[PDB]
Amino acid sequence: DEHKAHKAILAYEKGWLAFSLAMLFVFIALIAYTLATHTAGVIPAGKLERVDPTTVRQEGPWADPAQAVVQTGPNQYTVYVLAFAFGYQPNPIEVPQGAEIVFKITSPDVIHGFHVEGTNINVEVLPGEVSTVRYTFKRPGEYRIICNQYCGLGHQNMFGTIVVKE
Amino acid sequence: KPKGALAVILVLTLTILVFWLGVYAVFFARG
Amino acid sequence: EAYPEKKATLYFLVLGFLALIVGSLFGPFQALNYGNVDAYPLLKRLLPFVQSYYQGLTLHGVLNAIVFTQLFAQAIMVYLPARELNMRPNMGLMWLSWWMAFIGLVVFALPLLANEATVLYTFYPPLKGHWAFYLGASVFVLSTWVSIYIVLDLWRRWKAANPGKVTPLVTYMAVVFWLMWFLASLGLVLEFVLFLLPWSFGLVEGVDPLVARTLFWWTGHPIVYFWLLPAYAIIYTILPKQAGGKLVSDPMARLAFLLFLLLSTPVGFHHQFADPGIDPTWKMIHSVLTLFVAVPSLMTAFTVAASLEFAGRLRGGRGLFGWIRALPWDNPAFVAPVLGLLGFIPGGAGGIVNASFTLDYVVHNTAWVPGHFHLQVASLVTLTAMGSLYWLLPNLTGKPISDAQRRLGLAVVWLWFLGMMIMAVGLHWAGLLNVPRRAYIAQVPDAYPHAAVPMVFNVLAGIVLLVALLLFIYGLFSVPLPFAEVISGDRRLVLAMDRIGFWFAVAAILVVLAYGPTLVQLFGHLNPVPGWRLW
Ligand code: HAS
Ligand code: HEM
Ligand SMILES: CCCCCCCC/C=C/CCCCCCCC(=O)OC[C@H](O)CO
Ligand SMILES: CCCCCCCC/C=C\CCCCCCCC(=O)OC[C@H](O)CO
Ligand SMILES: CCCCCCCC/C=C\CCCCCCCC(=O)OC[C@H](O)CO
Ligand SMILES: CCCCCCCC/C=C\CCCCCCCC(=O)OC[C@H](O)CO
Ligand SMILES: CCCCCCCC/C=C\CCCCCCCC(=O)OC[C@H](O)CO
Ligand SMILES: CCCCCCCC/C=C\CCCCCCCC(=O)OC[C@H](O)CO
Numbered sequence: 001d002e003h004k005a006h007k008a009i010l011a012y013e014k015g016w017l018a019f020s021l022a023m024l025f026v027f028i029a030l031i032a033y034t035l036a037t038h039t040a041g042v043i044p045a046g047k048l049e050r051v052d053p054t055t056v057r058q059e060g061p062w063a064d065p066a067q068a069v070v071q072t073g074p075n076q077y078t079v080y081v082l083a084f085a086f087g088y089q090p091n092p093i094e095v096p097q098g099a100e101i102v103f104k105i106t107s108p109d110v111i112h113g114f115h116v117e118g119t120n121i122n123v124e125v126l127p128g129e130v131s132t133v134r135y136t137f138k139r140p141g142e143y144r145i146i147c148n149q150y151c152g153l154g155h156q157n158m159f160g161t162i163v164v165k166e
Numbered sequence: 167k168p169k170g171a172l173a174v175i176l177v178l179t180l181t182i183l184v185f186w187l188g189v190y191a192v193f194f195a196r197g
Numbered sequence: 198e199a200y201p202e203k204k205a206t207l208y209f210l211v212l213g214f215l216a217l218i219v220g221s222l223f224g225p226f227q228a229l230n231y232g233n234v235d236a237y238p239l240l241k242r243l244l245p246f247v248q249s250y251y252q253g254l255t256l257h258g259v260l261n262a263i264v265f266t267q268l269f270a271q272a273i274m275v276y277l278p279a280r281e282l283n284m285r286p287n288m289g290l291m292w293l294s295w296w297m298a299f300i301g302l303v304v305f306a307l308p309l310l311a312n313e314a315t316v317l318y319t320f321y322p323p324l325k326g327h328w329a330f331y332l333g334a335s336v337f338v339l340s341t342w343v344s345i346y347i348v349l350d351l352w353r354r355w356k357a358a359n360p361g362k363v364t365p366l367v368t369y370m371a372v373v374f375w376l377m378w379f380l381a382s383l384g385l386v387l388e389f390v391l392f393l394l395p396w397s398f399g400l401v402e403g404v405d406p407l408v409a410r411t412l413f414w415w416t417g418h419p420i421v422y423f424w425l426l427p428a429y430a431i432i433y434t435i436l437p438k439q440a441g442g443k444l445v446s447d448p449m450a451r452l453a454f455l456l457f458l459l460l461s462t463p464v465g466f467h468h469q470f471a472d473p474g475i476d477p478t479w480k481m482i483h484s485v486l487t488l489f490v491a492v493p494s495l496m497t498a499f500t501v502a503a504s505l506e507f508a509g510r511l512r513g514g515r516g517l518f519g520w521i522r523a524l525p526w527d528n529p530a531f532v533a534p535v536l537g538l539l540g541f542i543p544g545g546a547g548g549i550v551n552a553s554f555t556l557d558y559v560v561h562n563t564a565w566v567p568g569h570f571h572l573q574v575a576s577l578v579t580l581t582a583m584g585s586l587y588w589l590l591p592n593l594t595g596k597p598i599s600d601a602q603r604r605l606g607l608a609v610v611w612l613w614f615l616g617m618m619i620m621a622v623g624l625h626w627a628g629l630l631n632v633p634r635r636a637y638i639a640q641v642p643d644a645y646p647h648a649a650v651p652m653v654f655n656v657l658a659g660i661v662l663l664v665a666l667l668l669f670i671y672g673l674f675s676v677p678l679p680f681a682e683v684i685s686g687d688r689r690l691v692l693a694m695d696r697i698g699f700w701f702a703v704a705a706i707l708v709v710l711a712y713g714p715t716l717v718q719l720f721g722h723l724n725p726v727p728g729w730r731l732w
């Protein structure tokens with residue numbers, strides 16, 4: 001009885017472990033795929049870029065919000081975003097649709113989310129690092145920026161805005 | 167044969183699959 | 198006298214459930230908040246030291262996710278092996294370990310209760326809390342190092358007496374588990390030692406937020422497996438008796454556990470998928486190894502389902518589903534872990550979503566995450582702890598559980614389980630609506646209107662769990678270990694898995710290989726930045 005059940009349970013567990021493992025592999029293959037598309041742009045560049053959080057509001061690309069949007073290609077724009085307590089400059093960020101947007105976001109105080117609602121933009125912002133991400137907005141309109149990394153008592157009311165023009 | 171255990175891991179696979187394919191889908195929608 | 202290990206083990210349980218009660222008080226308030234309802238005026242009247250939602254949230258996570266969990270882990274994963282070996286722990290160390298825990302707890306609790314350390318249970322720099330938080334917490338966590346020694350002592354002493362014997366199952370679980378925990382703990386010890394302590398004492402002016410995050414999540418994942426594996430130990434070696442059956446495979450159990458020693462630690466970057474400065478190839482690698490570490494639980498699901506089925510067919514249940522009803526749904530020690538096991542299905546599921554590199558950008562730092570992990574720690578671990586109260590409290594105190602007390606226990610378990618299911622729905626759903634975690638949203642009520650429906654779920658969960666908690670306080674204040682047999686049918690696997698030093702080495706090498714290259718680059722380019730107090 002028991003020696004038959006321990007045999008059968010185990011013979012079937014073995015199939016299950018094979019199967020689950022393959023599903024896991026398929027997932028891995030599917031994740032690989034995303035890595036090869038443009039949708040992979042939202043993965044932060046691997047890339048250390050230090051900056052001084054004490055001077056970033058006072059010298060450099062972050063120090064004149066109104067010129068933070070800079071054509072860097074024929075169809076690419078770099079945007080220098082400051083994420084601070086409690087908010088984002090510029091407000092708003094204006095970019096052309098269909099243009100590839102390189103966001104270069106840092107913080108002058110604490111860590112901040114940059115989760116662009118309705119998109120896959122969702123990056124952490126660490127003081128003294130520049131986070132780099134890419135998106136091409138595909139519909140024009142207002143997108144809301146949320147902060148999803150607790151940063152003090154103003155956390156719940158820290159939003160920003162990206163306006164995509166046609 | 168352990169039909170009961172097999173059921174459980176069946177519900178599991180499906181739950182996993184819905185979750186995972188569910189969010190793969192949302193990902194491409196938002197990308 | 199003959200088991201003063203009971204007295205210590207007990208002290209551990211009581212303090213953790215102490216921590217759980219106090220922690221959970223903030224729970225229903227945070228649930229109503231995620232149902233767009235601000236009840237905090239009410240809270241700030243009962244507990245007028247509470248100055249913010251975020252201070253309550255710290256208390257909650259720290260007391261529930263670190264304090265309860267660990268104390269429970271120390272209770273179970275010291276005592277159980279000792280009883281299996283019928284041997285005595287070093288009671289000098291076992292009391293040292295408890296005191297470091299108690300004294301460390303008090304020492305960080307002070308700033309917490311004083312709005313001096315309202316960082317979360319993650320304390321990410323530059324957010325800067327009181328020195329006593331980092332000191333306090335330091336001592337608390339190192340209390341488990343002592344525990345690690347205790348059990349390796351026990352094991353070695355036993356292996357002295359019994360060479361050419363393989364390690365016995367529970368103790369083999371306990372050893373691979375404490376070995377895993379030491380390895381895993383280093384990142385955070387490193388973080389405290391090189392960074393957090395010097396910083397809060399004023400010795401250094403900055404910490405590098407990226408490097409602190411990285412050293413943190415080195416520890417920050419395996420800590421959850423260190424929460425999980427006491428409940429696993431019980432689900433494996435006690436539960437199958439509670440249900441009326443047996444463990445279907447001893448090696449299968451060891452294998453799961455061994456896989457956890459190898460794979461719990463080298464995975465941390467899946468908390469850092471949205472971090473800058475970490476290299477995407479290294480993020481893919483960790484993604485791969487994190488899909489791998491979900492394997493011992495895929496395995497566990499089967500071994501355990503099989504064991505329950507075996508129980509319910511022994512107990513005369515016939516069908517595809519006969520076996521389920523034939524089980525002891527009158528025994529809260531059976532019911533509670535089985536319910537957690539259920540909610541772990543979707544919990545594991547969401548866990549596997551979070552681990553895919555690019556899928557994380559959908560859900561990262563939304564309400565999805567807390568949804569995922571309440572299923573895992575707040576339910577499956579906690580319910581396992583809760584229901585064990587019904588065999589463990591007798592075994593430690595000699596006090597019986599009445600019928601009435603048994604019934605009250607079933608109710609709580611069920612209320613708590615259902616609450617958790619409901620909140621889990623509300624939270625996953627809000628997360629998919631891009632509702633963020635760690636947010637006092639009731640305070641911006643017109644902000645997430647697309648989330649009305651999952652908000653109803655969250656309110657309901659709020660009062661369901663409030664009542665659950667209220668009952669559990671009332672019940673707890675009102676109040677041979679049932680090891681299962683293994684079933685009859687490899688000595689080759691079992692012997693190889695017992696080369697424990699060997700496996701420990703591999704686990705150590707894998708960390709070096711998974712974290713080394715990236716931490717070297719990090720330490721060559723530190724950018725410490727000033728602390729802030731924004732609460
Ligand atoms: C003790 C608690 C924890 C467990 C266990 C746990 C499991 C997993 N997690 Fe997780 N999770 C992640 C990946 C997973 C994966 C791959 C697993 C795996 O271990 C899951 C494997 C499990 C399964 C595949 C399911 C097995 C099911 C079973 C065993 C059911 C058996 C059924 C039976 C026998 C019932 C029979 C009954 C009948 C009678 C029918 C990732 C990402 O890669 C993140 C980061 C997300 C982000 O963006 O920040 C994360 C974040 C969290 C957070 C938030 C941390 C924070 O504050 O920032 C915490 C607290 C947490 C806890 C825990 N986590 N997790
Ligand atoms: C009465 C039961 C409880 C309720 C209703 C409940 C509710 C809550 C809510 C609504 C959140 C999300 C708050 C936010 O993201 O801002 C939260 C946070 C949290 N929960 Fe609980 N929960 C309870 C019990 C537990 C238990 C038992 C655990 C530990 C085993 C736990 C661990 C956590 C942790 C770690 C966090 C995240 C803290 C952070 O992000 O810093 N909860 N819970
Ligand atoms: C026993 C454990 C679980 C207990 C069972 C759950 C009890 C929930 C009650 C449901 C009845 C519905 C009553 C709803 C009526 C009041 C709603 C209300 O007044 O709304 C709040 C308002 O919008 C803010 O200002
Ligand atoms: C899109 C993909 C669809 C997924 C939908 C669910 C997939 C099935 C789930 C689990 C199967 C696990 C069972 C595998 C068991 C193999 C049978 C076996 O090993 O049988 C041994 C026996 O001795 C005979 O000789
Ligand atoms: C049993 C025999 C073994 C057979 C088992 C094979 C399992 C196949 C699973 C996935 C294939 C991957 C296909 C990847 C295509 C993904 C494309 C997609 O979904 O994205 C489109 C979007 O428009 C882009 O931007
Ligand atoms: C039990 C749980 C059931 C839960 C049910 C799941 C609900 C998922 C909803 C949306 C997924 C995708 C959301 C992404 C929204 C895309 C909208 C968009 O692309 O545009 C917004 C922008 O602001 C235009 O100007
Ligand atoms: C028992 C406790 C329950 C556990 C918690 C369950 C709550 C969420 C469940 C499944 C999420 C599945 C993924 C959700 C995404 C599916 C929506 C979809 O199909 O969206 C595609 C569309 O293109 C996008 O805008
Ligand atoms: C046995 C214990 C639990 C085990 C199993 C529990 C897992 C539940 C799985 C899916 C729930 C959600 C259903 C899937 C959601 C449907 C998609 C949807 O709602 O559509 C989105 C659309 O964009 C609208 O806005």
Ligand SMILES: CCCCCCCC/C=C\CCCCCCCC(=O)OC[C@H](O)CO
Binds near residue numbers: 521522524622
């Ligand atoms: C919002 C989400 C809420 C949905 C939450 C539901 C999730 C699963 C519920 C119950 C699982 C119980 C399954 C097994 C049933 C146990 C009771 C039983 O089988 O009764 C036997 C009888 O007592 C003779 O002994």
Ligand SMILES: CCCCCCCC/C=C\CCCCCCCC(=O)OC[C@H](O)CO
Binds near residue numbers: 234653657
């Ligand atoms: C008798 C034991 C079980 C009974 C359990 C009842 C069934 C669960 C369904 C709803 C309860 C939730 C009621 C939540 C309280 C009011 C909801 C709310 O706050 O709604 C906001 C609304 O969308 C804008 O004002």
Ligand code: CUA
Binds near residue numbers: 084086087113155156
């Ligand atoms: Cu900025 Cu939260």
Ligand SMILES: [Cu+2]
Binds near residue numbers: 417418419465467468
């Ligand atoms: Cu993790």
